[PDB]
Amino acid sequence: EFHKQTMMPHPASAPFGHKRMRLSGPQAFDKNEINSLQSSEGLLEKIIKQ
């Protein structure tokens, strides 16, 4: 979780963002991919694993 929200962005010159976030421009991704840009964590992952 630290890493995913910290390897440096370097998207174009220095807009200082995220690679996947910056990639919204080149392709108008569907609402599904927009939601999949982020995700949940913690309890859900361990529960699914168990």
Binding site: S24, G25, P26, A28, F29, D30, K31, I34
Partner: protein, 174 residues
Amino acid sequence: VTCVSQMPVAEGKSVQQTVELLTRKLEMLGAEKQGTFCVDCETYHGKLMYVMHYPLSCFALFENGPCLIADTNFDVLMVKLKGFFQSAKASKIETRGTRYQYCDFLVKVGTVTMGPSARGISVEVEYGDCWSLLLEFLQSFLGSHTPGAPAVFGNAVYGPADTMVQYMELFNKI
């Protein structure tokens, strides 16, 4: 990919009643409510503004689809040209409506903006030409319609916002 839209060939009754009949036929075919979107339209004397699926806009009089900017990213540039390209004429009509999806597909009909406007429809596919397969869908849905007329012998390609030409053509037809 992004299949070209179709003009509202069927026009024999009230636009509201036409949209109602189209939705009833879609429900009879069997689908689900995939949400509702909008199709903006604002021309500058040329560049027709719009926004759809998601946070990104387009406006281009005649160019090779220069879109990779969001609504704000383009609106700020537009406002910056208050004397260079500021050609905000009478607000162009813009349609909207809900969206359904039978399977691997999506349908979207339009409505009038000021009242004497069109009620066009938009459909796309999931492949990369597949123009033949998508046709049978509308053939079973409604009567003679969906001319298509894609940009054949090119691989514009995949039709990225290429429907804006037909959109402006129907908008001028008033």
